Ligand binder design. Structure first.
Ligand SMILES: Cn1cc(C#CCn2cnc3c(c(-c4ccc(O)c(C#N)c4)cn3CC(=O)Nc3ccncc3Cl)c2=O)cn1
Ligand SMILES: Cn1cc(C#CCn2cnc3c(c(-c4ccc(O)c(C#N)c4)cn3CC(=O)Nc3ccncc3Cl)c2=O)cn1
Ligand SMILES: [Ca+2]
Ligand SMILES: [Ca+2]
Lengths: 123, 123
């Protein structure tokens, strides 16, 4: 008989995005081609099987820079990082394949499943 | 026309609680009477006006221990910390006043408002 606050998690997440936008307590840079994106390892770990697997390792947890593979589309990554911090996924025919490839690489099932639904719902 | 993932923020928050429960990337201890609670400053800042005000200050951001006032009820704090990381508030006649005093101190409006509703809904 606890009281569930349906909007609390969204409120937290939006505030974490504000922290990211002000570089407050960010602790890692993700390098994708010529792009650098700062973020919070905790959020990355909470949103991605790949990042979880990297930073849960006692040896790799202290890394401050992670390089993603050169074949990763930087726009795909930016779209997924924004999703991580906002719950909103900008998905369009022009980017679905990049988003889906990136979400598979990052090990983000809900997004991959949604890309499947997008595909199934397009002609 | 972005796709909103209604459960994403909750999924993130639950994973952040798992990180807390394993002391992964925790960076502060909150001391309330004889109790010590480890947490993530980012989450505290995202959930509390008091903690936001403390750690947004460039001078106090690097603190690893925060002492709360001796008159703060440690159970009230534990209840609110759990709420921060789960969205679930364990509110009962036996603890409402402690929870509400602690939520006012921590500057958590939604919880304070809910305590008001609890009061208004009790005889
Ligand atoms: C080839 N391929 C593989 C896949 C996959 C997969 C499965 N998977 C695994 N790990 C994941 C997640 C998601 C996740 C979370 C919210 C989302 O909204 C989405 C989306 N969207 C994803 C996060 N974490 C990491 C994780 O659990 N942290 C964790 C575990 C235990 N204690 C503490 C921590 Cl922090 C996830 O989906 C997709 N394609
Ligand atoms: C005497 N009294 C005062 C009050 C109050 C108040 C107002 N207040 C202020 N700051 C707050 C919050 C809540 C909050 C969030 C989710 C919740 O579910 C609840 C609850 N529940 C609370 C969080 N933050 C901190 C904040 O905004 N971080 C922030 C701001 C800008 N960029 C980055 C960051 Cl991280 C808040 O409610 C209540 N009683
Ligand atoms: Ca490579
Ligand atoms: Ca005092």
């Amino acid at each position: 008989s606890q009281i569930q606050f349906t909007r609390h998690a969204s409120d937290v997440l939006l505030n974490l995005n504000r922290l990211r936008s002000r570089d407050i307590l960010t602790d890692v840079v993700i390098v994708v081609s010529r792009e650098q994106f700062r973020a919070h390892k905790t959020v990355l770990m909470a949103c991605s099987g790949l990042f979880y697997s990297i930073f849960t390792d006692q040896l790799k947890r202290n890394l401050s820079v992670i390089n993603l593979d050169p074949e990763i589309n930087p726009e795909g990554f930016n779209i997924l990082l924004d999703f991580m911090y906002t719950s909103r996924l900008n998905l369009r025919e022009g980017n679905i394949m990049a988003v889906m490839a990136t979400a598979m690489y990052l090990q983000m099932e809900h997004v991959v499943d949604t890309c499947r639904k997008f595909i199934k719902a397009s002609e």
